[PDB]
Design a protein around this ligand. Structure first.
Ligand SMILES: *[C@@H]1O[C@H](CO)[C@@H](O)[C@H](O)[C@H]1NC(C)=O
Ligand SMILES: *[C@@H]1O[C@H](CO)[C@@H](O)[C@H](O)[C@H]1NC(C)=O
Lengths: 43, 258, 26
């Protein structure tokens, strides 16, 4: 990833944002992800 | 959210509720970009046309909720607001340009399985995901439909809704309304004008418009539920605050704590 | 009409005292 904010002005989280505990961390996809991931035709 | 569905628990740990203290009232939605900062729509905080001018004390935020009403203890965490930072060049009089604001939680909030911050995009992620056709996601406890079968004000969900919407080309977004849209907002919905339906309605403001980068597997908040005419209106698209464009501002504020 | 400014989304809490008809429709 890439720390953009300053850990002390921003707060904790920056380095692990966007990763849900009940899915990503667990390698579990949610009901509708595929509908989104499949829409990213971009290379 | 209209045409959406029940969100699996912990589907959006960042989703937040902007709660008015007295009287208690669920105002808008919000996000968690950090344990000290909450992002939400500016008009949720300031809107003269409706005698709407809240301050740090008038309200607070509830994080990690699922139910639109009960107090899910041992899960959701309440937090008092320390300072509200609504974008200066916010324009509540004309087109609601730059609808955005930052919320500084008095005391940092503890993370968990149901509360985890969302990621702010970067020039690189935006350019590749924020394009016409690419679908994004939105979540909130807003109205399930634009209208009211009036003898029944029950169109408000019992649990956090979630709808997947695709982004619409700028020109179309422009044509869709007489209102003057800017490069500080983008719209999404369906033209297909049948296929699937769905949009955010009253009460989804501040709600995040997120996308999961197929590259690093993380969720990014491209927009903020701002405005729209009607809800799920054919030939009509929703409008969210372009988050990446106000990154600069966000940066400024956080770095100088306002 | 005499208008058009966008409809902000935080729900109508500010006027949840709204419109319909003086009752009569299916
Ligand atoms: C909000 O009220 C504050 C605090 O009393 C005042 O300074 C300001 O004029 C009000 N906001 C607007 C732009 O109406
Ligand atoms: C969808 O219907 C809208 C709303 O009536 C109309 O403005 C639009 O041109 C239609 N889209 C088609 C038929 O391509």
């Amino acid at each position: 990833f890439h720390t953009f904010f300053n850990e002390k002005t921003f707060g904790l989280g920056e380095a692990d944002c966007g990763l849900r505990p009940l899915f990503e961390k667990k390698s579990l996809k949610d009901t509708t992800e595929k509908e989104l991931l499949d829409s990213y035709i971009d290379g | 959210i209209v045409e959406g569905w029940d969100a699996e628990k912990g589907i959006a740990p960042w989703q937040v509720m902007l709660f008015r203290k007295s009287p208690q009232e669920l105002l808008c939605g919000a996000s968690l970009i950090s344990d000290r900062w909450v992002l939400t729509a500016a008009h949720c905080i300031l809107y003269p046309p409706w005698d709407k001018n809240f301050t740090e004390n008038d309200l607070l935020v509830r994080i990690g909720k699922h139910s639109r009403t009960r107090y899910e203890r041992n899960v959701e965490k309440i937090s008092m607001l320390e300072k509200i930072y609504v974008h200066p060049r916010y324009n509540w009089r004309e087109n609601l340009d730059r609808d955005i604001a930052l919320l500084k939680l008095k005391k940092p909030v503890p993370f968990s399985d149901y509360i985890h911050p969302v990621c702010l995009p970067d020039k690189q992620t935006v350019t590749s995901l924020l394009r016409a056709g690419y679908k994004g996601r939105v979540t909130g406890w807003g109205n399930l439909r634009e209208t009211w079968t009036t003898n029944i004000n029950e169109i408000q969900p019992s649990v956090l809704q979630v709808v997947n919407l695709p982004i619409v080309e700028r020109p179309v977004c422009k044509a869709s309304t007489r209102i003057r849209i800017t490069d500080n907002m983008f719209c999404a919905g369906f033209k297909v004008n049948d296929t699937k339906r769905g949009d955010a309605c009253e009460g989804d403001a501040g709600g995040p418009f997120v996308m999961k980068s197929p590259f690093n597997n993380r969720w990014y908040q491209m927009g903020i539920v701002s405005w729209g005419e009607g809800c799920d209106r054919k030939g009509k698209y929703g409008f969210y605050t372009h988050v990446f464009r106000l990154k600069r501002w966000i940066q400024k504020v956080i770095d100088q704590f306002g | 009409k005499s208008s058009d400014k966008p409809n902000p989304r935080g729900y109508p809490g500010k006027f949840c005292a709204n419109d319909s008809d003086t009752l009569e429709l299916p």
